[PDB]
Amino acid sequence: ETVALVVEATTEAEAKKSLREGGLVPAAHEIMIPVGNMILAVDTQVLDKCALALAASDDPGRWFAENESLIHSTVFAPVAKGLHRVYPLLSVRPEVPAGYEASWPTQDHMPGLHLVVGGTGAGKSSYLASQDLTLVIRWGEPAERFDVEGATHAVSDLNEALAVAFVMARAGYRPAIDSFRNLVFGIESAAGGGISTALYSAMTAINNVCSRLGIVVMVVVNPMATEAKAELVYNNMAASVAGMTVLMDGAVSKQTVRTLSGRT
Amino acid sequence: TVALVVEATTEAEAKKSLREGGLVPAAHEIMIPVGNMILAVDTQVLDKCALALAASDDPGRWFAENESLIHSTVFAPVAKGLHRVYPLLSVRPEVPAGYEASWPTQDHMPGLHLVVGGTGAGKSSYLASQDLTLVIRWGEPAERFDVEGATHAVSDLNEALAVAFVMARAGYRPAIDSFRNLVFGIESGISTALYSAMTAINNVCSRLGIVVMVVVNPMATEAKAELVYNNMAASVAGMTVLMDGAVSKQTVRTLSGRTWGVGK
Amino acid sequence: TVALVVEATTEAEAKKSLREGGLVPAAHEIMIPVGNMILAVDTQVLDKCALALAASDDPGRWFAENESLIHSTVFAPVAKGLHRVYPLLSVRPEVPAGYEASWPTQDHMPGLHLVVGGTGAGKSSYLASQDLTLVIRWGEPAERFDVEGATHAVSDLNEALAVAFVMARAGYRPAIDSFRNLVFGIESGISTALYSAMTAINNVCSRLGIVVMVVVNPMATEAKAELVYNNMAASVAGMTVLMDGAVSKQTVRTLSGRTWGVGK
Amino acid sequence: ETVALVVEATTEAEAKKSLREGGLVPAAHEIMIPVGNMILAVDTQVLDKCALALAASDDPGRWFAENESLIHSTVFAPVAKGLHRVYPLLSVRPEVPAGYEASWPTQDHMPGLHLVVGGTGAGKSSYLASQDLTLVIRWGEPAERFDVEGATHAVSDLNEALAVAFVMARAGYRPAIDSFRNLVFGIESAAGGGISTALYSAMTAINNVCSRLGIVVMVVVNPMATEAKAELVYNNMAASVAGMTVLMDGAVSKQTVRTLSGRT
Amino acid sequence: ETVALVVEATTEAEAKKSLREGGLVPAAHEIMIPVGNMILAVDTQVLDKCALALAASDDPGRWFAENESLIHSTVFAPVAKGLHRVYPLLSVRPEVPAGYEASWPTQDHMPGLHLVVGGTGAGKSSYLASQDLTLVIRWGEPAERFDVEGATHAVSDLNEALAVAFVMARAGYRPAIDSFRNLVFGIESAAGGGISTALYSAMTAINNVCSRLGIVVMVVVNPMATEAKAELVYNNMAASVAGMTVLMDGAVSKQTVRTLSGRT
Amino acid sequence: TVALVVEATTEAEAKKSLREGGLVPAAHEIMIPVGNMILAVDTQVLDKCALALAASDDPGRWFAENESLIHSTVFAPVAKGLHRVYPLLSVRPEVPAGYEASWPTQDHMPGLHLVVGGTGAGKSSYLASQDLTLVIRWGEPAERFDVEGATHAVSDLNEALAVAFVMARAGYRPAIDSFRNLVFGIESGISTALYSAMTAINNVCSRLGIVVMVVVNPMATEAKAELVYNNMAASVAGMTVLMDGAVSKQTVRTLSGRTWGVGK
Numbered sequence A, D, E: 001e002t003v004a005l006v007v008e009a010t011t012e013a014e015a016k017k018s019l020r021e022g023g024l025v026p027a028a029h030e031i032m033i034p035v036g037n038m039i040l041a042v043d044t045q046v047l048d049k050c051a052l053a054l055a056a057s058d059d060p061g062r063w064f065a066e067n068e069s070l071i072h073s074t075v076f077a078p079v080a081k082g083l084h085r086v087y088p089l090l091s092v093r094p095e096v097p098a099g100y101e102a103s104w105p106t107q108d109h110m111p112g113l114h115l116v117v118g119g120t121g122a123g124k125s126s127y128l129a130s131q132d133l134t135l136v137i138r139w140g141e142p143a144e145r146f147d148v149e150g151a152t153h154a155v156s157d158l159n160e161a162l163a164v165a166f167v168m169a170r171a172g173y174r175p176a177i178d179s180f181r182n183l184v185f186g187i188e189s190a191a192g193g194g195i196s197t198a199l200y201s202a203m204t205a206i207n208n209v210c211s212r213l214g215i216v217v218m219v220v221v222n223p224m225a226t227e228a229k230a231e232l233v234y235n236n237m238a239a240s241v242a243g244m245t246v247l248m249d250g251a252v253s254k255q256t257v258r259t260l261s262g263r264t
Numbered sequence B, C, F: 001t002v003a004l005v006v007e008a009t010t011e012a013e014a015k016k017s018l019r020e021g022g023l024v025p026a027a028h029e030i031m032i033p034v035g036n037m038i039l040a041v042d043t044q045v046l047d048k049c050a051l052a053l054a055a056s057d058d059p060g061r062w063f064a065e066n067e068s069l070i071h072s073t074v075f076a077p078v079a080k081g082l083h084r085v086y087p088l089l090s091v092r093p094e095v096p097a098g099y100e101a102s103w104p105t106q107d108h109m110p111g112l113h114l115v116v117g118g119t120g121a122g123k124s125s126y127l128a129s130q131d132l133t134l135v136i137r138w139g140e141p142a143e144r145f146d147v148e149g150a151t152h153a154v155s156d157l158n159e160a161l162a163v164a165f166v167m168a169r170a171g172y173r174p175a176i177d178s179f180r181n182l183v184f185g186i187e188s189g190i191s192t193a194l195y196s197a198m199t200a201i202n203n204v205c206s207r208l209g210i211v212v213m214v215v216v217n218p219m220a221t222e223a224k225a226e227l228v229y230n231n232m233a234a235s236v237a238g239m240t241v242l243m244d245g246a247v248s249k250q251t252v253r254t255l256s257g258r259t260w261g262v263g264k
């Protein structure tokens, strides 16, 4: 259950071990998540251990508070260096598990991300606080009023943000991440309204982890698009995920959702 | 098995196959340069798998049950010196003796047939008109296509190529939806290394006597689309451009000449 | 003492504190990502120093006599793998229980209060109106401010942060003049990594329940000033813009809302 | 006759050995060829061994087919890392061997490259198939009709392309390379119509190998120049080599050749 | 007194030694000087040894000529690699020593640099030869008439230029450096009239060494600003140092000096 | 002999000469920084060769028979730390006592005399009017100049400099045609490192009391030519601009002043 931090495989026998152990071959319960030039991994056994403990608990708020570190351990960054070579141009398999059904965020919503997008000050963070959410995971944003009085959980890195969201959604709760600010800032690639196009692939990768898990996670993203190129940028963002809600001046201006039987 | 971490450090080891961590391709290894990556296909493992798949009752099930053989069919060699030893590597353009084609068009050169166009141009739904055996889904978000239809989802470029190669050598008709991560991941008004990557993969298909259909959204601007589309067309056997759900342009290199098409 | 050159090379060493050359923060270590750098504050050493400073007759003299303790309070960990282990690291946004503020404004969120504007806008002299305990001078040329007035000059970002943190935890009011070297030294129409660096430092202040005033000349063009100033304001608790010696704009995030100001 | 692939000189005694052996000092029969950031080497003893065997053979087509690997071994990429330092800003000596004469491509043509240049689709590949050539070496281009029925030889990398061209021309035959596409794509430097100026130096380096060898090699180059800047780009290309033919819409539009007694 | 050139600290005990010895911790008489991505160090004991020997000498010109190498050893580049990490965003402390007084270049001039700025051919070098200077240190400029007949001392690198200037000024003489040409060329960072903004921080760092030493050094700087953006660039240069004189067509057009009691 | 691969790893080895793999120039070694490269001339070997050449019946034959001595005269030191130890290295501007000049012009400063202009401006043929001893051909395609005329062809920058230095110290008049590969190979509207490279080589000539004529095609645009030509002229002793075969501008720094010329 311990993650290798420094020591990676140097022999072929060691290279065959799990990512957790410092090898190069995912175990059956490890899914790699490419994000820019990083490769993370979710351990779906740890994930469902935590999610089941939450969902089955007589006091899930208390279990959460007492096991935050275990929850955060669901997603980690493997130590082995050769992953980019061994798995070229890695993505995540687009899947929908058998018997998937959804009423939230909308009826028959495809599993994946539901993005809440808009410019600086558009009201995305406030929009969340008015949806019927279980928990807002606060990451990479300056401390605001949202952090003093709401149902929030503050985290420090992308492992923690994804771990809490995955565990909460797998348990049957409704999580949102506010926000992917540090992905927008951190990811760099060939541009297409000045947007690093690797942002789109990162959102698709995380989206498809959600799809394989049969969950929807709501996520705030300010892509930093100029006024002219915002329509194109939002279209490419919507084409990368299951659903999108656009905020302009505190009001919803557009919403599009891929559904099990269509696209709305 | 493929060597994952131990590479040649002596001249004797360097003479061994790419699979074994050496620098010299064995009789049945073909190197595939893709951007700054170098992959390899083992044509003996390939035709092994193609024979096994040909006697299968479910192509889709065979692939899901044989991920070990697929990763043996196309892999990324561990030896670091390949870029230096094989300067400006491509794949040699060949046509096997006795090659015949009626799909996608009559006398179509073996190679890639690109299905290209902008976001939401209808490329994914266009594949439904092409009498394909199945669509290999890669790098795209989970969509209606992935739950209703003959698809096989993969995670990386080795897997996408291996499945398509095995399918085509067995006599089936594959498409890859899509090469999105080549567009985003290759960086060098599009990076010229996208064009050489398509020529390299195209010529592997030419050596194998196969045609693989491939979706590409190049993320070009309206001003530069016409240029980027010619550059793409000059890299491959054939190309079909979609706009707003309809074919607007087509060009195919054939065994004795060239065809063109113009629509709306 | 802080490890300067020997870092963890075994899994057992990796579990040790950042101070000791490991990769896992001890109970009282908080990582501070700044561009491609990762610093750490030790909150136990911090409150040690804050108690010692609180019983001092000269804050300025105490700092000059305790450079060893200051370099123990904020330091740059030696272990190289931190960027990989903690992906897209930020600082978690928190507000300590019982936090109260009347300075710089009523109910001001803990965080940074930026004093911003172009060259010669009057930022350094503006600090004289803010009832500060002293101005921490960093990255600026020797000026009249440095010979006449309550200043303490430092050389690097660890020192600037440590002095400000110790001062504020002890109940004094610090300003840093200036973050010039963050503007110049962070590079990635301003580098987006300046914004994430300010959010990270801001949220360390939020966790500590303090406000630190900080001068920033972002070197933006007249055309882009309005945009860069919103991006800066969206990264921190509060911001005051100077033009030609006068406040032209202000915005502050408070415990229950937001304030704005407009001048000439 | 074996080329060092992994093991390079680590002592001064080893550094004095030939490039073939992993040393840093060319033997009398090794000529280094700088191409972008690469350094190749032609072994002129292997070259003239192959060329003489071809030229003296009762069945040169059969000798070629039976010795393709030996032919390809004429040019290799040395393993030693310090070559760029030891030979700063390396080029190739401009020489014309005593008693040089030429009737092909034109009368009294300077030894060197004869470039066939023009934009995408301009008819360069077809132009070759109408010159009185012995062999077209196909490299880096997608498989086309040219590869099914003509006198062609398909290769994979720049070593092979140069080896076959040098050997064929030294034997008294007339070779062309279609094309230097992967040099245009692969080489990057300070631009001057957007053309990486290291393209010009690569063509001069290869040109001067041809001049030292007393041969002319015809080479297709599509420099990817915009319409506006094509006149300047073609002029700089002509200034880098012995001769140039420009194709526009399948017709020759300009031709310029440096001659032993003038410039036409 | 010997400087470590190759061997740096590899243990914590060694890391605690002086920069001269290959450690990471400045001795009490070492001041680090960040310049772009370099870190130099001035040894103030060697500095004042040389300066006192000069100032006390019955024949200071002869002592200078006989001890040039010792003078040049006052500033060196430490060998230890971790300095950028250990001292994040390093600058130099802005200080003015107690009892500082100045009549040169102007009355009550702040200690620091006095920049002589202007475009190519503006007359900066000639301007120096008309000020009442003791010595012009010539660095990085092509040999000109200034080097044949004047009171000059030619040096090769930034250590030597700073060493001679510091020693001369500490001895009570009046030095100028003509010029910082290689800093302008060598330093690269995010731009703000195309000027690498790390140029401003380098000038502030060197300025503050002068301020800590209670000296003024005159320095020629041609920032290579375009005509349009020169006013802004000169303003940012003046904001980085104690004083500035601008030359246009061989005449002084602007002069600004920070004084102990004001700014002129 | 020059060390090619073994460099200093102890402080004792570091004190040895550059030739021997150390970091400290011997009495007669002068470092020559060129872009990111650092070369060295050994002035004792130089004057050895100049005496031998002076008693030669064919300068051209002497050079071809003494490639070993030429590579001992200018070489690239193996030690890696030189950039750090000698920050922003240049060459000190000097004029030897007793220097006199009548070529290329009266009282011409020792240094480079650049012959500059665009493609086909007539720079190579202009050298025929300058009463040269021979033209050192480097980096240019084989031309009529190379078969008819007094030329000596070389391959790299060490060779070009060494031949020119030896020729000039022996009393002959060398020109280098051309520095093309400095223009293409130095990259940092021209890279400013071209200008500092010319100043460094210029000042080596100044220390040696020689003038070397050098052709440069800087590849500037018509809009930027005037600026790039001043920047080049401000880097060297003298410069002549060619347009369409005729001198259009000239400037020369002399022992006591400056000359200028204007043509068509």
Ligand SMILES: [Mg+2]
Pocket: A124, A125, A126, A141
């Ligand atoms: Mg928000």
Ligand SMILES: [Mg+2]
Pocket: B123, B124, B125, B140
């Ligand atoms: Mg699609």
Ligand SMILES: [Mg+2]
Pocket: C123, C124, C125, C140
């Ligand atoms: Mg200020």
Ligand SMILES: [Mg+2]
Pocket: D124, D125, D126, D141
């Ligand atoms: Mg062609």
Ligand SMILES: [Mg+2]
Pocket: E124, E125, E126, E141
């Ligand atoms: Mg000057």
Ligand SMILES: [Mg+2]
Pocket: F123, F124, F125, F140
């Ligand atoms: Mg010429």
